[PDB]
């Protein structure tokens, strides 16, 4: 039985980034860049007006002038030179005609006469005003994105700016998932027979892996039969998946075949971890027959222990395989809203609902946590709406309301419900 | 020109939750529940062993006993009664045979004899030990999930536990997106002609809306022609979308037709907002001809202003339409890592890269922010890797390094890179 920090170190050490692939622009969203991106031309590639108004010779100053061209896009005003004593109409983003060196916004002008257009410039501007010189936003050949950078909406915008519609990225791993147990029935089952429960772990893990943006291979319910489980594991290993997640069949039962099968097919690095919830957690590395590595997590059957182990150990593995340079979860410090009794032996991943408050109970703003109630590993209601796992050290003491603890954030911080 | 708080209030007031729909279990992930979910049977539905070991009569105490049945699942041990002086083998989750009232884990036992199985119980247990009574995790008819609750991995697990594979939820809105401008070319363009730039806003917004888990209707580049834009807007309004996002054609240019077209087709509530970056932002409500409401955001053309307006105004609208009870973004308080000059008029949404530190500069842990550099609205590099918008009030003063500010978190807090 090893501590969680060592189990994490072992997993990190074995887990290797996947080979990069080439994807389309919209397929690159959420993925980590596997190449630098350089701008092939400047932004703007022509001197561009910041305003709707008139391009002028700054030294002319206030006065009445003829409008000699109109420039909004493309070739508008090509071959026209704005000489002293003339102006040109411009819209925001419109090319500045040759000879003009400043823009006066339309609010500081007035159109004069009926019909040959004439405008009155009402201010004394300065050379360069309200003009974006060539490459002022992005210089030609500048690096706009680098290897190891995750692609979000702004990064897609930068790729589109640079004319990149096919992108070299690190792919997401493909994850196979199965449930084990003679007591399991499908979640479509209505009336349950004696000694049956619905398989909840498989759908829970399919959803958890879909939230990590990975493809899922659903291998269904497997019975507590060594030959049957070996066949499904052999089929999973040869299918091309990168990660296998099983649940159950990893405790001390006489028909728990996941750990001995993983010892036979590959290298098991650990089967037990010092923590609450649970204890059994097998991690193995299997070589597929040519040729590649498959990581296997023999997750515990208890629904809570299953999802907590997915959150602490599988999520950083998915991220490492997908090329994340920072795969660890966000850890914050927070104050307890109620007292919690800590265990004298097992450090606990206590489920909580956390929120940011203007006063965290100490007079200054901060996160605060509410427990989800009873933490028994069989009680999936303790995971309901939990957006954090409080890291409670094994002291045996009651942590009073208002005391500060470390907390792992397990669900979208941008999706946090406000206080 | 109205303040951002009033523009937000107006948007919230007009935006209505979409009618609920029925979806499959995996389609319900990310969606908000539109019904309560009750457990049709208890969990566990039979007295279940917490351990792999032996079910006993607690009052028997330590001694040697015959093993009269084995119980792992289903009908194992049905019709067998564990009487005083007998025991039954059990695995975790296995049904407790009639007459047994406690479980002794296999570690506190030893098998005796060769071959008729016999076991030695090594401890004095207590009635109820290591048994999950019927409904101890979930009682029959208990409410396991409620209306207004967002479905994540644990909630999918609870739906599977309760045998619910078709779920009543609030759907995501469908969003139409178009770009405007005679200066635009597709992002596939190689060498640019004079006065052209690649359309970056459309792909940026398509990606931003895909991150909000909404279906996208890509309506492409529209030119600065009033009849052409009216036709594309009429087609968008009649297509069945809930939200329309345009960008550009909303400043003071003589070919900016988005605002006058939105005034003609529906009700425009505002066209200008007091903020930095930018200023133009049209919001309108259109009635589709029978019959439903379509919300239109005439977003600014400047890439930064376009994405910031999407983040502050469109994201809470998507969430309100999708039935979120808490659609506002997470706001935290943080310390500046560098000095920032605030504007004397326009309150700013200053882009920053924020991280949680053990020491935020004041001796206690907290978030800290680094500016992304120059904040010009034409500079999409200022959005690069920005996970927050610092809310800088319009004071005209320099906010020194170490001063605290309010910050809107705009990207996954669970995806935050650690310090
Ligand atoms: N799709 C787009 N991608 C990049 N820049 C744009 C886009 N649409 C408009 N712009 C720019 O945003 C600014 C304001 O646009 P407008 O409001 O149409 O004058 C101008 O500099 C435009 O060139
Ligand atoms: N797919 C599943 N869904 C819900 N509970 C499960 C699942 N698989 C195993 N369990 C339960 O988790 C506990 C430990 O499983 P095991 O390690 O197979 O003994 C037992 O109470 C099982 O009934
Ligand atoms: Cl039945
Ligand atoms: Cl436990
Ligand atoms: Cl060309
Ligand atoms: Cl601006
Ligand atoms: Mg089992
Ligand atoms: Mg335009």
Swiss-Prot record, chains A, B:
Keyword tags: ATP-binding, Magnesium, Metal-binding, Molybdenum, Molybdenum cofactor biosynthesis, Multifunctional enzyme, Nucleotide-binding, Transferase
EC numbers for this chain: 2.10.1.1, 2.7.7.75
MPT Mo-transferase: annotated segments: 4-416
Catalytic activity as recorded in UniProt: adenylyl-molybdopterin + molybdate = Mo-molybdopterin + AMP + H(+); molybdopterin + ATP + H(+) = adenylyl-molybdopterin + diphosphate
GO molecular function: ATP binding; molybdenum ion binding; molybdopterin adenylyltransferase activity; molybdopterin molybdotransferase activity; nitrate reductase activity
Ranges that cross the membrane: none
EC main group: transferase
GO process annotations (BP): auxin-activated signaling pathway; Mo-molybdopterin cofactor biosynthetic process; response to metal ion
Cofactors (names): Mg(2+)
Top-level taxon in the UniProt lineage: Eukaryota
UniProt pathway: Cofactor biosynthesis; molybdopterin biosynthesis
Keyword Nucleotide-binding: yes
Similarity comment text for this entry: In the N-terminal section; belongs to the MoaB/Mog family. In the C-terminal section; belongs to the MoeA family.
Known function: Catalyzes two steps in the biosynthesis of the molybdenum cofactor. In the first step, molybdopterin is adenylated. Subsequently, molybdate is inserted into adenylated molybdopterin and AMP is released.
Protein name: Molybdopterin biosynthesis protein CNX1
Source organism of the structure: Arabidopsis thaliana
Lineage: Eukaryota, Viridiplantae, Streptophyta, Embryophyta, Tracheophyta
């Amino acid at each position: 039985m090893i501590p969680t920090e060592e189990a994490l170190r072992i997993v990190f050490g074995v887990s290797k980034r996947l080979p990069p692939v080439i994807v389309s622009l919209y397929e690159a969203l959420g993925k980590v860049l596997a190449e630098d991106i350089r701008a092939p031309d400047p932004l703007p590639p022509y001197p561009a007006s910041v305003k709707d108004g008139y391009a002028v010779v700054a030294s002319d100053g206030p006065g009445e002038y003829p409008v000699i061209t109109e420039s909004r896009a493309g070739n508008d005003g090509l071959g026209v030179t704005v000489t002293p004593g003339t102006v040109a109409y411009v819209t925001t983003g419109g090319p500045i005609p040759d000879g003009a060196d400043a823009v006066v916004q339309v609010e500081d002008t007035k159109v004069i006469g009926d019909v040959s257009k004439r405008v009155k410039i009402l201010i004394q501007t300065k050379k360069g005003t309200d003009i974006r010189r060539v490459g002022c936003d992005i210089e030609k050949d500048a690096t706009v994105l680098t290897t190891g950078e995750r692609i979000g909406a702004s990064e897609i915008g930068l790729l589109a700016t640079a004319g990149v519609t096919m992108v070299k990225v690190y792919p997401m791993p493909i994850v196979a998932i199965l449930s084990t147990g003679d007591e399991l029935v499908e979640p479509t089952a209505g009336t349950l027979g004696r000694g049956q429960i619905r398989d909840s772990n498989r759908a829970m893990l399919v959803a958890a892996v879909m939230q990590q943006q990975c493809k899922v291979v659903d291998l269904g319910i497997v019975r507590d039969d060594r030959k049957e489980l070996e066949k499904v594991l052999d089929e999973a290993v040869s299918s091309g998946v990168d990660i296998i997640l099983t649940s159950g069949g990893v405790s001390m039962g006489d028909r728990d075949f996941v750990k001995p099968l993983l010892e036979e097919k590959g290298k098991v690095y650990f089967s037990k971890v010092l923590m609450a919830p649970g204890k059994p957690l097998t991690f193995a590395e299997i070589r597929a027959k040519p040729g590649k590595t498959v990581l296997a997590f023999g997750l515990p059957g208890n629904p809570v222990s299953c999802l907590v182990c997915f959150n602490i150990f599988v999520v950083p593995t998915i991220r490492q395989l997908a090329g994340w340079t920072s795969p660890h979860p966000l850890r914050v410090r927070l104050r307890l809203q109620e007292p919690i009794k800590s265990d004298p032996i097992r450090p606990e991943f206590h489920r909580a609902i956390i929120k940011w408050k203007d006063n965290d109970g100490s007079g200054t703003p901060g996160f605060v946590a509410e427990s989800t109630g009873h933490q028994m590993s069989s009680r999936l209601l303790s995971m309901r709406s939990a957006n954090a796992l409080l890291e409670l050290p094994a002291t045996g003491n009651v942590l009073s309301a208002g005391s500060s603890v470390s907390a792992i954030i397990v669900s979208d911080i941008s999706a946090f419900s406000i206080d």
